[PDB]
């Protein structure tokens, strides 16, 4: 039980080392998780004039918040959806990072636009350079996408105790895109056909879609079906319902995506994973 926040970066890392050993987690994984939580706290300060979130977390960071470190893939990006703002997100994040949170500050590199088909307004990528009490701590790649259909209408609010465990008690509360839209977007991505030079490498989405199916439990799939239809129609590429094909180079990508997840009941080959996700597609499509 730590009585006080870490005096400095060296103390922060020593506490992170101790907690990671206590938890049986890779140090760098916990350190990245803490960096992500810090960026998410900056994002959680961004609100519209009613106080509603401007940014919702998605991607691997959301799955790590939903499932915990032991039960989620290692990933690096902090992926977000901007619920209203455009280029104002970057300016507002930069201000939030300068003000700081619980001793952490951040400078953000310039936003660069990303060319993605089916999206009228392009995603933006940049990097958060984090410091703790003056000294550089970690860097976090950030991606910001615009709203699609209803994927920002509602949000889940998730938490982590990782900073509490190193003596930083301030409540963590992270607004996240809901599971129906995460499923819709990952199903679209994992079944997308890319243009001749590019090729789809997204076999890891087969892991995340199994993890997301598990989190729906016995839920009615109707919100997920509506989100799936909305995303597939909005993007105007391949139609709903898709076929979960696998590409010849996917077996080892999928194996890499399983690293650290031996204790979970997941498909152990990419064929079995495609079969599982295809069954999920059919179950979603059946909903009424």
Verify that 170 and 205 share a domain, yes or no: no
Element (H, E) at 226: helix 222-235
Within a domain: residue 53?
yes
Within a domain: residue 1?
no
**How far is it, in rounded angstroms, from Cα 206 to Cα 195?**
21
Annotated binding site for Mg(2+): 2, 25, 62, 77, 79, 85, 109-110, 135, 143, 156, 161, 177, 201, 220-222, 243, 245, 253, 255, 257-259, 261-262, 264-266, 268, 275
Q: Which residues pair with 245 in a beta bridge?
A: none
Annotated binding site for Ca(2+): 213, 217
Verify that 146 and 42 share a domain, yes or no: yes
Which candidate, 42, 64, 62, places its Cα nearest to that of 53?
42
Verify that 278 and 189 share a domain, yes or no: yes
Verify that 244 and 159 share a domain, yes or no: no
Verify that 36 and 154 share a domain, yes or no: yes
Q: Which residues pair with 131 in a beta bridge?
A: 105, 136
**How far is it, in rounded angstroms, from Cα 129 to Cα 110?**
12
Annotated binding site: 2, 25, 60, 62, 73, 77, 79, 85, 109-110, 117, 135, 143, 156, 161, 177, 186, 201-202, 204, 213, 217, 220-222, 235, 243, 245, 253, 255, 257-259, 261-262, 264-266, 268, 275
Within a domain: residue 83?
yes
Q: Would you give the distance in Å from CA 251 to the centre of its chain?
A: 23
Domain boundary among 143, 177, 211: 177
- Asked if omega into 121 is within 30° of 0 (cis), the reply is no
Q: What range does the domain containing 266 cover? A: 180-286
Residue by residue, DSSP assigns 16-80 as: HHHHHHHHT--HHHHHHHHHHHHHHHHHHT-B-TTS-BSEEEEHHHHHHHHH-GGGS-----EEE
Q: Which token pair is 220?
A: 């009615």
CB atoms within 10 A of CB 23: 15
Pairing of strands 78-82, 135-146: parallel
Query: At 131, is the secondary structure helix, strand, or coil?
Result: strand
Largest CA distance in the chain: 58
**How far is it, in rounded angstroms, from Cα 61 to Cα 142?**
11
Classify the C-alpha dihedral 224-79-71-281 as positive or negative.
positive
**How far is it, in rounded angstroms, from Cα 133 to Cα 38?**
13
Q: Which residue has the tokens 């989190």?
A: 215
Annotated binding site for CTP: 60, 73, 117, 186, 202, 204, 235
Query: At 202, is the secondary structure helix, strand, or coil?
Result: coil
In angstroms, what is the resolution?
1.6
C-beta of residue 202 within 8 angstroms of C-beta of residue 189: yes
Verify that 72 and 211 share a domain, yes or no: no
Which candidate, 105, 142, 148, 146, places its Cα nearest to that of 127?
142
Q: What radius of gyration do the chain's Cα atoms show?
A: 19
Within a domain: residue 43?
yes
C-beta of residue 123 within 8 angstroms of C-beta of residue 92: no
Which candidate, 177, 125, 148, places its Cα nearest to that of 235?
148
Q: CA-CA distances (angstroms) from residue 131 to 32, 41, 136, 144, 216?
A: 13, 14, 4, 22, 37
Residue by residue, DSSP assigns 154-179 as: --EEE---TTGGGT--S---EEE--H
C-beta of residue 82 within 8 angstroms of C-beta of residue 144: yes
Verify that 124 and 252 share a domain, yes or no: no
Q: Which residues pair with 82 in a beta bridge?
A: 55, 146
């Amino acid at each position: 039980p730590y009585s006080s926040p870490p005096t400095n970066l060296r103390s922060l890392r020593d506490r992170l080392t101790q907690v990671a050993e206590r938890q049986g987690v890779v140090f760098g994984r916990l350190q990245r998780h803490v960096a992500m939580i810090v960026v998410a706290q900056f994002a959680a300060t961004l609100t519209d004039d009613t106080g509603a979130p401007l940014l919702l977390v998605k991607g691997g960071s959301s799955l790590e918040l939903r499932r915990g470190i032991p039960d989620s893939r290692t990933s690096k990006d902090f992926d977000t959806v901007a619920r209203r703002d455009i280029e104002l997100i970057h300016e507002q994040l930069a201000d939030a990072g300068e003000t700081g949170w619980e001793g952490f500050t951040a400078i953000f590199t310039a936003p660069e636009e990303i060319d993605v088909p089916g999206m009228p307004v392009k995603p933006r990528r940049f990097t958060a350079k984090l410091s703790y009490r003056g000294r550089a701590f970690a860097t976090v790649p950030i991606e910001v996408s615009s709203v699609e259909a209803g994927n920002a209408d509602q949000f889940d609010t998730l938490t982590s105790d990782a900073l509490g465990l190193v003596g930083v008690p301030a409540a963590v509360a992270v607004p996240c895109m809901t599971i129906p839209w995460q499923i819709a977007q990952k199903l679209h991505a994992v079944t997308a056909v890319l243009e001749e030079p590019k090729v789809n490498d997204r076999a890891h989405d087969l892991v995340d879609l199994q993890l997301l199916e598990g989190l729906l439990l016995d839920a009615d799939l109707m919100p997920t079906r509506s989100a799936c239809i909305a995303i597939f129609e909005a993007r105007a590429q391949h139609p709903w319902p898709p076929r979960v094909a696998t590409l010849p180079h996917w077996p080892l990508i999928y194996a890499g995506a399983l690293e650290g997840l031996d204790h979970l009941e997941l498909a152990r080959t990419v064929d079995a994973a495609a079969q599982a996700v295809q069954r999920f597609v059919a179950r979603i499509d059946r909903a009424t």
